[PDB]
């Protein structure tokens, strides 16, 4: 499946030791499908594959 | 979570407080002062009739 548009919003972030931050993501896909997800930085880390 | 307030000493009157935590939700408080009282310490001296 493809995806055309997306954005993104980050309600709440503490740069603790433990997983403290979430963001929340919108998205339209072309069809049903799984998808995997990954970073383009070395600073964050994310917890779902 | 400690929180500090000050109120002033008038009688039949509602005040009110924000508590703001981050990461959540804001609180408000509401306080009303119904009765102060003093009372001294005596001692007996002599009597008369």
């Known amino acids: ?49 | 979570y400690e929180h500090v307030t000050v109120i002033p000493n008038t009688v039949g009157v509602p005040y009110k407080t924000l508590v703001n935590r981050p990461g959540y939700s804001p609180m408000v408080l509401e306080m009303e002062l119904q009765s102060v009282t003093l009372e001294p310490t005596l001692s007996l001296d002599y009597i008369t009739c």
């Open chain 1, 1 to 49: 499946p493809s995806v055309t548009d997306m954005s993104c919003e980050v309600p709440a972030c503490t740069h603790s030791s433990d997983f403290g931050g979430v963001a929340i993501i919108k998205y339209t896909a072309s069809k049903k499908g799984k998808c995997a997800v990954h970073s383009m930085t070395n600073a964050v880390t994310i917890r779902e594959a």
